[PDB]
Structure formats: C-alpha cells, structure tokens
Design a protein around this nucleic acid. Sequence first.
RNA 1: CCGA
DNA 2: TGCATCCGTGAGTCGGAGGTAATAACCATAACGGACGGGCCTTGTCAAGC
DNA 3: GCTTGACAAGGCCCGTCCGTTATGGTATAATGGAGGCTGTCACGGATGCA
Lengths: 490, 49, 314, 49, 383
Amino acid sequence: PRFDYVKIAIASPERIRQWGERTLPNGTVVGEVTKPETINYRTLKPEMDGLFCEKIFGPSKDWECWCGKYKRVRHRGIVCERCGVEVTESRVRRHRMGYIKLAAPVTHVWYLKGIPSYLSILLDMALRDVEQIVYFNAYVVLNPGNASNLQYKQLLTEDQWVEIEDQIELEGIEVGIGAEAVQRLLAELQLEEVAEKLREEILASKGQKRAKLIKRLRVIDNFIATHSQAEWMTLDVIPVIPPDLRPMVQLDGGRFATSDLNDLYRRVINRNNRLARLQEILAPEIIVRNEKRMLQEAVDALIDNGRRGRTVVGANNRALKSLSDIIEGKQGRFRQNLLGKRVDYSGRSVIVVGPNLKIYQCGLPREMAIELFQPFVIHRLIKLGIVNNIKAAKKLILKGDPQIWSVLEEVITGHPVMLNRAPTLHRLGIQAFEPILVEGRAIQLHPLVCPAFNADFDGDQMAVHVPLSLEAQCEARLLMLACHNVLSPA
Amino acid sequence: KASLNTDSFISAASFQETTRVLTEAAIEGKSDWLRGLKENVIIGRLIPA
Amino acid sequence: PYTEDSIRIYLQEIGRIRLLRAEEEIELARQIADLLELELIRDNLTLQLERQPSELEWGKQNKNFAAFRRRLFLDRRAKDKMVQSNLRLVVSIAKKYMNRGLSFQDLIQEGSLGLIRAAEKFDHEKGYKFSTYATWWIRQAITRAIADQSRTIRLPVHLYETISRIKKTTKLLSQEMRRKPTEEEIAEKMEMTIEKLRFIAKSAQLPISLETPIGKEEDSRLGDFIEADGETPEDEVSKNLLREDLENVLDTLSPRERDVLRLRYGLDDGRMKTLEEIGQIFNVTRERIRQIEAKALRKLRHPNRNSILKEYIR
Amino acid sequence: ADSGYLTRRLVDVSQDVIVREQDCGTERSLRVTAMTDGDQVKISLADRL
Amino acid sequence: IEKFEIEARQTKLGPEEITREIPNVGEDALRNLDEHGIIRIGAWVESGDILVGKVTPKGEADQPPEEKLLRAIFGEKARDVRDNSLRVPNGEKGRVVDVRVFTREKGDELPPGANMVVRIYVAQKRKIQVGDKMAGRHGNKGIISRILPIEDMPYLPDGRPIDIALNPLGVPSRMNVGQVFECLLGWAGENLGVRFKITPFDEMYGEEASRDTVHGLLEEASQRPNKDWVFNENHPGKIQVFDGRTGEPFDRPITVGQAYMLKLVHLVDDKIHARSTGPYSLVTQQPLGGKAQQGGQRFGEMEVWALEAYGAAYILQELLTVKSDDMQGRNEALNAIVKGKSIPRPGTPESFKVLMRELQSLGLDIAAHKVQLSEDGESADAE
RNA sequence: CCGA
DNA sequence: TGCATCCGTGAGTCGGAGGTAATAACCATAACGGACGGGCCTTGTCAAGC
DNA sequence: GCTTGACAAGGCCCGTCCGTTATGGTATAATGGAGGCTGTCACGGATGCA
Ligand SMILES: Nc1ccn([C@@H]2O[C@H](COP(=O)(O)OP(=O)(O)OP(=O)(O)O)[C@@H](O)[C@H]2O)c(=O)n1
Ligand SMILES: [Mg+2]
Ligand SMILES: [Mg+2]
Ligand SMILES: [Zn+2]
C-alpha cells in the first residue's frame, strides 16, 4: 500500500503485547514464548511452545496443520480444533511475531549505556550510580522519611544497609535494587512539576549548571509532547522476531545451519524460567539476586552485544551477532541490502578494444546475450509461431538452433544496454549502448569511451545490465546513451 | 555534523551512528516525511529528482 | 572499586559469608526437618480445605500464632543459611564442567538448585557429612542442565547415555581388534541396528552458525551460500500460462462437462470434490457424473485439435 | 579509504539539494575575482565566469 | 583438468541411488553412461551432458489443479523419484580421463551419511583466444584483442611475418626499458643460435655495458654471409618492416626482436558470466552472488549515486524492486515480458519489511502512516 | 590469498 | 574552572577461489506417543436396463 | 440421459504394544576461575581531579 510518513517512538508494554497476541475462536490468546525449544530432533518439526511454534508463528507448510488432518487447500481461514494451528499459507512466518513475559523488570541498554545516557539525565543521577543500581551492586533510598542521615536517591552498600538495620530509624525506610528500583523511581516522577521547576530554576542559576538544566529540560519536554511515560525505558515484555528472519536450515550432510539470534533468545528464556522457578520455591536472596543480574545481562546481549560488559562469544570465540549488529554497520541492513542490491538480468566479462566499430555501440557476446535477453527471446519464439509455451522455448534455447540466433538478432535491435565498470567514481561510470552480437567471449568496447570509464585492456571487466520496462528503455536512450555524454559534468 | 543534524532520521540512521540516531529519534518521537533521494531508495519509490 | 566481572562480584558476595561447622549442620538439619514436616501438614490441609490455609495451622492444636510465625521464620532462616553457607562447594564443583556448552554462571545457578534439593533431602541421623550428599545432588543438577540446555536442537538424556555407551564400546572393541574397525561388530556388541547407529551418529552432530566466515578474512559468510527454498518465477509463469491455456481449451467443449471438470479438480473453487457432491451441486446422482467426466476426458484425449496442451508433457 | 570516506560524507551531506523552483527572487550576489597566489594567476576571470 | 564429485547421500525419505533410469531424459543422452549410470573413460562431454545419473525419493505429492487435470487427460503417471544428476556446467567441455568410484563395501570409508562417492576428472586443451591475458617478464601485461592471418601480419625483408605487435607507447610511460634490451638480445641470439645468459646489474663491468653488449652481438649476427639486413648502423635497434596487406614498407624503421611472452591463468572462459533468474537469499530474498551459484551483479551505492546524478528514476526503481526482493513484482514482470504486455507498478521491497520487523524487535514503535481527508491511519506493510 |  | 585521562565512533568499490569444529556418569521406573490392526462408512469402477 | 446393484479401495477411528522420554535418585569427604593483552590513528564528548 501507499503511506505518507514513518514515525518512530518508544514501545509501551501494551504495544509490544499488541504486536504478539493473537486470539483464537475458542477464546485463547497465543503469542507468548515459554520454552527454549526450537525443533524436534527425531522429526524435524517445530515444538508446540517455543521459538518456532506453529500456534504463534504459523504453519511451516502451505495449507497444512501441525498434527496432520488438514493437509488440503480447501480448509481456508480455519483453526484446527485438536492442535491449534491456523490453516494458512506458510509465508506468515515472515511477519508474525511473538513475545516473552519477563519475571523481573529489565532496562533497555540503549537508554542506559548510550551517549548522552537519557536514563541518568531524566533521573538526575550519575551514570555510574544508575549502572551500579541496575546490576545489583548498590542499593538506593526510595523513601527517605524520618532520617537526617538519609536522603532521596542516595546510594548505599550492603554494609551500610545492614548497619541501617540496627535501628530497624524508627519509621518506614524503603530501599530498592535492580531495575525494580529504577522503574519505581521513574514511575513517581511528575513530568509537569519537574518541567516547571526547571523553568523556575534556569532563570536564577549559574553558567555551567544551566547547560545541564537545559539538557534535562529538553529531555523532559520530549516525554510530554510524545505522551510517553518515563517508565517505558524499563522493559516488562520482550518482543520476539519472526522465525523466518532467524532461519534454521539443514545442510547436505545432516548438520543444521542456525542464526545467532536463537542462542540469545534461548539464554533469555532459560534465565527467565529459572528465575520463576527460584521465586516459586523461595530461594535465598543471594541466589535470586544473581539470577536477576544474569537475566539483565542476557537481555542486554540480545539487544547490543558487548555494549556494557563482556562480549558473549560462540564456538571459536566469535562474538554473536545481535539485533543492533545486524543493522548498525556497513555489513548491516542499510548499506548492504537497502542502498545497494544484487540484481537479476545482469552479467560480466572481460573487455577488449573495439576499433572498426562506432560509438554508442558495444560488442555483446552471443552466449551472454541469450541469457540476458531470455524472456524477450521466449516472447518472440511464441509470437512467431515456432513454439507454443515456455518449456519448448527453453528447450530450443538450450539445445542450440540457428533459428535462435536470428531471433536474438531481431530482438536486441534497438534495445539499449547499460555498461558499468567499478569503481563508479562519477556519473560517466554507467553509460548505455546499442549492442551488436559479436562472436567470442569478451565485450568489445569503443576506444573513445575509455577515459570516461578509466578502462584499459589489460584485465578490466565490466558489468552489463538490461532495462526491462519501456520507461527504462526510453531513459537509457534519451538520457544515458554514450553519444550524448561528450562534456564532463565537473 | 550537518549530515547527522538533518530533519530525517532514516537518512541519518543509514549514514552513520545508527544506535544514537535511532535513540534520539525514538525519544523525540519524530516523523520522516520522505523528502530526499536516500529515503525513497530505501522505501522503494520513485526518487523526487 | 568498580568492576564489570559478574563472576568476581558473585565470588566476593559468597566470600562475605563464612563456612559452617558440623554441629551447626546438625542443628540446621533438625530445623529443616521441622520445616518440611510443617510444610507436609500444610500441604495436606490445602488438599483438604481448598487452598485457604494461610490462617490455618496445626502446630497450635493470639500469642500462639506469633510463636508459630517465629518458628516458621527461624526454620526458613535455617534452610536459607544451610543453602547460603555451602555456595563455595558449588563453585568448586562447577569449575570442572566449564566447556560443555553452558557458561560459568549458568552452571553455578543450576548447581545451586541442586544444593537446595540436597539441603531439603539431607538426613542427619546417618552420621555422614553434608558435603558428600550435596556433591551428588550438585553434580546431578549440573549434568541435567547440560543435557537439557546448551544445544539448539536438544537431545534427550537417554541419547546422551547411548552416545557414551557407544564411545565405551568402540574403544573396548578397538582395544580387542587393533586394526580394521567394524561397524557390524559395533552394532553387534551394542545389540542395535546399524541404521539406528547411523541415526545416533547423525543426531550427535553439532550445528554451525550462519555468521561463520568461510576463509581467513571477513569477506565471506556461510549464509551467503544458502539458497532460499521456494518456487522460482519461471515455474510461476509456466503454471499460470498452463492455467490460461487449460481454461481456453476446456471452454471449447460443452458447457456442462466444462464446469464438471472444473468443479472436479478445483479449477474455480480451489477445492477438489468427490463424485457425489457434484450430484448435490446438480441433483442427478454420481453415476452420470463419472460417465460425464469419462467422456470429457475422452474428448480431450482426441489426437486432432488437442495437441496445444501436448507440449507441456515433461 | 580516506578518499572514499570523504566521498561518502560529501554525498550524504548534500543528497537533498535538488533544483525545485525557477527563480528565488533575491538581490544578494557573489563577488568573483581571478584566483592568484602571488604574481601569476591560477584561474582567470573568464574561466570563473 | 577439472574435478567433479558427487555423493549418494542418505535422506530420511529414502536412500539416494546412482542409476541409469532417470525421468524426463531422452534416448541418446545415455550413450556415454555405463550400466551403473556413470560415464566411461575417454568420452567427450559438453555443457549439459550427464556425468553421473542420480535420483532421490521425493515424497510430498502436493499437485496443483493444472497438473492434476493434465495428468487426468494424458495418462502421465507421476514417479516417486526426481532428477538429481551431476551435469557439466556452462562451458567446461573436454575429455573424461578418470572415473574413480569409492564405495564403503569395497574397502573404503566415506564421510558419514553418504553411500558412495564418484570422482570424475575432465581434461581439456585450451588454445589461445581473444580475451586471454598475456605478459612478459617486465610487468607488461595485456589482453589479446585480435588474431590475424599471417598474410595480413607485417613481415621482414626476408619475408618472415611477425608473431605479435606490441604498442610502443606502453614502454616510456611505464618505464620498463629492459624489455627492449631483452628483445634485441634475444633476436641476436636467434640469428646466432647461442642462448645467452646475463646476470643483472652488469654495469659493474663498464659504462653502457648492456647497450654495448647488445649492439656488438647484433653486429656479429649481421656479419653472417646471408643475414646482413639484421642490423643497420644508421638506426641500430630498428630495421625496415613491410605491410602484409598492401606490400608497402612503413615510413619509419621499427624495432623488431624476440621476446619471451607468458600466458596467464586469467582466461576469458573463467571470467564470462550471465544470469537471467537463479536462486535467492534466505532472509533478504535478493539474488545470490558468485559464478558457482548463478549469481547476480551487485548494484552498489556508487551505482545508485550515478543513476541519481542522471535522471533515470524508472531504471533505478526497476533495479531495486522487480529485479531484487519483491517477489510479486518478479513474477508479474516475468509474466508481462513473456506475454508482451506492460510491466506493472512494483510494491514494497522485501528487505524493507525485514528492517521494519527488526526495528520493532529492538523495541521501537516504528510504523508507517497515511493521511487522507483529515484522517491518520497506521498502514500494514506486510499486507 | 589473487585480479581490476 | 582548566587540563589530563577515557571511551566510543569511523577508516573506498567490484570480482574469483576455498570452505567448519574439533576433549568430559550412570541407573530404575512410570508416563507418553507413534505404529499397527479390525469396524464401519465413504468412495470409485463394471455391468445390465429403460 | 439416467438408474440400481455388485466388487472392491481406502481414509477416520478406537483398542493394544513396545520403543522413547521425562523424572527422580546415588550418603567417606570434597567448600572463591581460567585465561588472554602488551605495534593503529584521529577526533569528540564526558568525566575527574587538582
Ligand atoms: N586497490 C585498487 C586497485 C585498482 N583499482 C582500480 O583499478 C585500476 C588499476 O589500473 P591498472 O590497469 O591495474 O594499472 P594502471 O593504472 O593502468 O597502470 P599500468 O598501466 O602501469 O598497469 C585503477 O584505475 C583503479 O580504478 C581500484 O579501484 N582499487
Ligand atoms: Mg587496467
Ligand atoms: Mg593499466
Ligand atoms: Zn491439527
């Protein structure tokens, strides 16, 4: 469909649950991943609750349920009453996503360990102190009531907290540790009150203090305009990527080829289930505290591996690729798959000199030309009444015929062809030519277009591209043809 | 610095420092109105030139 | 000091607690047994009173409820102390199982769960120390966590014990027969099928990541060579032209037999039907329907004026 | 690598400069002289206009 | 000599077998195969010929209504195996010289999960060709661009034609002067028959030692009783050369000699490649890369800048959508080209939806919106 | 590792 | 408040070939689930008749 | 242009049946971890310290 703009924001827990939850006709939601299983080892089918589950993500085959009994195409829009898998086409595993319900709150590592670290800006604390509270190395005072030695957002060690327990002062003093304390500190921050206090504080303050007050006020003003809560920087629900974007394929030899995202999700689910088990049976607090810190380090490695602490490695001490590592670099999604792609209807060969051949003309080899212009030849072989379908046309094309060469000669007449030599340093590195069929295997280039390509005949190769549409052939002829590119653009 | 201080977070994220640009764009809640050559290539549309 | 080593932080946190003595272990085991029998009578009261035993207690049958809460608090503190004081034994055991697939902290936490089970299963009336029974349960929990986690496509525990038995049997039959190793005698000494042995050896393989480099550089990747399993655009266009030519051939014959053949194979509904349900689409029953589709196939099997479809023969 | 990184930065800083209108209707101007480093010229005025 | 290897693996649906009975293969495509389905030693193979016939037991049997009706009409019993034979790639003709087969019950032991392994060696004699690389010992590379007949090649005043013409402008810009010393000394040794041997840095024995050695040996070769056209004292390194087409001598004397030229591994047969439509990638659904997997050329970011510096918005749009990772656009474009109609308008590419799902899985509420008549609504890009 |  | 120390961020484009990881308990016992075999019904051909 | 009757074929469906799989357990005593960096360069913030 068409759209006008793209808007980015912070995801709430209800929104993350809205991406993952899908209801059934029986009245049951199916969106939560509860087990770290992927597929069964005996039969290579996904398990009924896990990272590849067919109730959450969809069927692995077209119009087929998991347990059987619905193998036909005729059941459309139905859900199996025995298994629970909707009988749909199997391409919904590119789109359908799930979620993981955490047993403890966790902080997003983008908002804590970034620069300028918006969590410590909004909390008005130092980054080392918030990083010490989150990873269970220090306490913090949530209720400073009835004390002169204690104040709000003050950090304490374990010794300082057990020596406060001498006085049992004689009132209710609360403390907190981990991301529960950070979530409770963010949940009680009145945004309009702190904003008007900062606006009443900037007009009467010093020089270097004023820049910090301006930075905190401009962070706080974003949370009122976006209508987003400050406690949404701590995660209660974790979204799970669709399973076809983290595929698990089998190689010829029996070994399975997996992606690195499955190990990180498996660690998150394993530590979550162990934390729920420890909280169920009332384990000692030194064991439950180490389990929450490990879950915190597990969620951070899934999002950005090696951002805060030790980098999680694999088999040969190679670091696992994470959700920000698949997008953040020159091998990521932007620079390798969106701004530049591999294309169909293309080829390459070495170039030779082309004297006794005009400008705007390239010498295109014949075996290269039957491959690049194959659907245009297939269309002409049916229009001329030689064959009747694509299979006879492909058979006569591959078997070799003298009719195919006359057909290709009358097909490539007037069809411009774009030539490219890497590196493409300026505009004249891609130019369009009218091909003539030469015999041999090299591409014949005209000697006058050679400084425009920076190309000599001692080993250079050039790529060839065929425009398909009629607007694309009219643009190669009127805008890119080599007999109109005499002057430099610089 | 002038490439990263543009009105479009898609171009600034595809250029350099993707994590920081996406974090400030998510906190500021900003929209990308698809005005430029680099966004329409990523979207898949005709470029506006 | 500030550090980012969580293992060092946890080792300092367990080094802050001292080690027990033996009479301490006897007294804590007595309090743990008291706690467990109190939880047993609590569990049978929940099984009798439909899970509303929070205000019910058989230890008394106002100050008595406070004494009961104090007793329960001291027994729970005794259990937590006996678990907490022995966390050094878990670190001393779990440092041997380091490179089998789990990290150090996962082995420590699973051995801690095993230590919890050993502290709730200890018998002080046997004279034995706590460390032997604790070592048994900690190694049990660590090996069960290895067999349950640390593999993407996980294998059951009996498969791991079968792999170990096969390793021992092959090494013993290689000590006996020094040359010419024989899978026939390997399957003989294990009393199993040779294709079952090949299945065990195939399931025992480890996966390889799609992000591993192929050469000694960063230019290549394993996922760059894996083809997506789908249908080509050539097959799509060939079956679409086959569908169009098929409909244009079928609409040349009589209109009744054309829709009979179309409802028979799902060329309009997307649902292949039986012979009787054509008899409920019409009202004439299914015996005329089979003769209709038979003579329609005989008319389409004519040598003249039907060879346009004969080129799709593969 | 230095040359190509400079080229990528220059492309990203000015990927949205398209000719949109025919005239802006301004009175501001740029003074052009012949570029000289010493007594001999480098670019003359006729080449610069 | 090329080497081809095929393994008869073990599949869950059944064992793969190497056989002579292959479906959808004609009569005379099996003449070179033996009784087991393998080629014999000394057979000539070209591109597409069967080396080892192999089948595997496919077992899904999910047929569309078109195939069901076509097998209702014309008989057409669908077999349980499919073709998986080893074939010669595009090009790579030659003679089969070694057909060694390894079987586990013959005494061999294999990679696990494979029944038998066949290894086939195919040898070919490659002549010199237009597009091949050629070089000397002085860094003077080049590509052959024309092969002329000897009646068209220039010839010497004894009537002997020239084997190779090199451009003289590649010498003083590249500053490799020793090739002219080498060709003149080799031509003196050709006219004498002595096969010289000269160690480098020979200017220790005097000033202009290489020049004096070369011209003195050329003079002594020209003092032969029949060969006095070899050296001219007016212009030393040059002699008169005649044109093969007209018979006229060239206006200026030309340096001739005997050079030692080399043929390099960069031949045009290993360089030519073309793709119409092949396999695709797993997640991105873009064409693969590489000659071995019939991959497509990468249209990188600099090529996108070059197309944007032109006009050419439609060339750039079809290069990014209907030629890569838009599957409905791929099918529609191929159908419109085959049926001769207009190619329709493309949709959202597949990698952009992958990026949207990845940014959502990072925890960012990113969505596309559409405004129409005072209304904002979130659009569904997955459709 | 090599080639442009 | 100025200077020293620290940390995160970047470092050109295409093509070919080869090619990865690599060591570590054992035992009873019940619950579970796919496979296999009769029962009934639904379905698909021969065959004679108006 | 249909109709009824014989002859089988084969999916659903509910029993056992045996191989797989999950779970619990073992009682001398054992009580803080191996394991690599150590030859890049330059710029910009952010601490941090005198
Ligand atoms: N690391 C490299 C090396 C080479 N090239 C490209 O390859 C060409 C190399 O030309 P080549 O023929 O190898 O050398 P010449 O410059 O022609 O010099 P010579 O004639 O002496 O070989 C360069 O222009 C350049 O565009 C490149 O992009 N990157
Ligand atoms: Mg060159
Ligand atoms: Mg050159
Ligand atoms: Zn089902």
